[PDB]
Symmetry: C3
Subunit: 273 residues, 3 copies
Amino acid sequence: EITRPPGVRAHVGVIGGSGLYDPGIVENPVEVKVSTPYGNPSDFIVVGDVAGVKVAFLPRHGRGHRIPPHAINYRANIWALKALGVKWVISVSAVGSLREDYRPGDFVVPDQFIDMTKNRRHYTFYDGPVTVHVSMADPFCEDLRQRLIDSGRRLGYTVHERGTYVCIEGPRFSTRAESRVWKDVFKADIIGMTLVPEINLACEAQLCYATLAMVTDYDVWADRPVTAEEVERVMISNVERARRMLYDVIPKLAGEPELERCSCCRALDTAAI
Amino acid sequence: EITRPPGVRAHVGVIGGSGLYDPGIVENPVEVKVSTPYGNPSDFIVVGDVAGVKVAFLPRHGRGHRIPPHAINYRANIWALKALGVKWVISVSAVGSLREDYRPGDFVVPDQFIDMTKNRRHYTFYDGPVTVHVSMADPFCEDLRQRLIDSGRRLGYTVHERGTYVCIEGPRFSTRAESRVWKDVFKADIIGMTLVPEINLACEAQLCYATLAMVTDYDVWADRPVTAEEVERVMISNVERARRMLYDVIPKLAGEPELERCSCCRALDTAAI
Amino acid sequence: EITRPPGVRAHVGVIGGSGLYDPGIVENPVEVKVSTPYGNPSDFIVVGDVAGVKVAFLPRHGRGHRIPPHAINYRANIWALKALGVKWVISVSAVGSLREDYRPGDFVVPDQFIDMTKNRRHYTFYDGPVTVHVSMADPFCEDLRQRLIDSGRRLGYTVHERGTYVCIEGPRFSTRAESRVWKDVFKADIIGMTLVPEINLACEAQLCYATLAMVTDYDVWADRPVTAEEVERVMISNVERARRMLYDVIPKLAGEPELERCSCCRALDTAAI
Ligand SMILES: CSC[C@H]1O[C@@H](n2cnc3c(N)ncnc32)[C@H](O)[C@@H]1O
Ligand SMILES: CSC[C@H]1O[C@@H](n2cnc3c(N)ncnc32)[C@H](O)[C@@H]1O
Ligand SMILES: CSC[C@H]1O[C@@H](n2cnc3c(N)ncnc32)[C@H](O)[C@@H]1O
């Protein structure tokens, strides 16, 4: 609704995770305040240009990693991006691996998730009187997933083309007994803390959302269990590769997502009663 | 405690789910306001007669399906029914199926559940100083389950006589990876969003509660995944069969539940410390 | 920060569960009020001496079992113990068994857990701006676990030396379908309602925390399902054995936990960003 400065619009949104607090990639940056009914987003949104495409960057944890996963205002974040007019949302996330072949340093473009959060307080925008139940059988935007995979291939990086993300509550990491459940019982591939309810809200807002995950650790399975310092060090070490992928992909998003390859682009048509 | 109009009492409660916003079945209807310590129930309770039995009808989603599963005031709803004197509670619900032989249009009378909710805020009436831990090994009222099965058989409808209900948080439907967990790992039969904490509270209030579920969809497993519009269309198409079952069952509930076939009828005797 | 009376300090904390509302074991008892940023702990903390070691006793449910698991102020409880200077925390808990050989009356010293809670509201002390993600691969303090096992052996009691605790939300007990999941799918050994987030917070506070669990029931698996009255009766019947173990262990805790056998003793060094 109201923005300061007024009149600002963007086409692509990038939500940065661990290690990605500044855009790096946007020219002509302007910090924008966007009103939301849910109060403050995680930080200012930075709007600028990448090869003629207008991009909105939001660090989900705020500058300086000030906001842990459970305390993020997910509703304000997604509302703010929608308000600016974005159609595509690239999330960049750090994840743990539950399988030997998904190695630290590899990218993953997941296609499924399992929600094991509990304390995120709001899992939807729709609390009534219009009841909305979106279909999320195929929760990510396939058009954007395929573009991410392609860019990774072209640049010569390893990109695993599928994966189930188990989203846990945190902020503590998993016990060994929990991790055995995620790996051996649920048959999940990667693990993180921030995907839900971000993805739910993106789908309800009819955005084309996909995750570019970077494997930072093997959870509890290496001779040393994951620590926060390790995750951060690995992301910061590799952020340049993530930036090179964004620069490659974003110019190709000048147009609109293909409806037939965007499960949520018309989600509300059959979801609202 | 206080009702408007004053003095109103009922013996059987019917909680209507998706597609069931009006009683249809009650003669001589009166809309009643019932005070609760938890504020407003979902809507007015409609009290009237069915073949000499006094019935209280409550639409859990309110008239017009205004209240999604996560926003229902479950405590107020059950408190209000208890206050009116009801002994039997029939819940009518739409569910998805996780097995080929439980087909859209079939009824199910479940006997078990698995709670995978997270955001319902209150799962009990007892927050202290009397600590209450009810046994829910056999969570539904067997007396009422058997009566529902019998009515269905007599009318010639398909009624599956057992089933495990997995209750999910919503309002979004399951991902494919989640649905594989419910089906192949938990070995659940049906899926919905509204049973918990409704059943918990019913048990704590010493009510004989059972669910008459109607299968509306196959979750993510048919060539088209479930949508909200499909669920609603299927319930509205079949509501007449649900009404015919209620008319058959209710006259037979003139008496009291049999204690030996009512796991929660004396739940508080051994549960309170 | 502020205590009344002023100047009080303790070295060992004991958190008593079901059936353990009074210390029994402390000489020279003083009831202490300890300020916390989170309001009231469950009750007064009782500080006194056991063979020259200063002990702080807190009943997690309050005197008279006034506070159910979901309503405990876990943050205030752990903050208060930390403020008094304690280094070791022994929790005494009632648990159900999911295996024939862990019998009512046996002690268990668990080594793992699985968190299936949902409604505890705060799972950490750290909501920002310092983000903290503690490693809990090995969540209990091994130094204290080994001391508990030793004491049990010396006194001639059965003490199972490992176990996975599944923590459920409650206050209702599990359905049969849930219990089959905990036992046959998760392969958990024991079940309770109070461990989480108590253990999370203990770890974040850099305490050496371990659980001495007493098996009070077989969950839904004996010909009679668990009831609250049974749990309480069994704990009260056996509290004397729990007291004899505490008297044996506490004098041996005059020193400090061994860092190499205390996973959380330096948890914050690698966890904070
Ligand atoms: C900076 S350390 C915390 C971040 O690590 C991410 N993450 C990385 N590895 C894991 C893991 N093994 N388990 C859970 N979250 C992880 C989470 O999404 C979280 O925001
Ligand atoms: C009107 S669409 C929403 C309703 O569908 C019911 N339901 C029907 N099918 C499913 C399903 N497959 N998964 C979850 N809930 C379902 C839920 O209890 C909810 O209130
Ligand atoms: C006094 S009865 C309630 C207590 O029983 C403990 N407990 C004992 N047996 C079980 C069980 N089978 N399931 C869950 N909690 C149990 C819980 O931690 C709770 O605080």
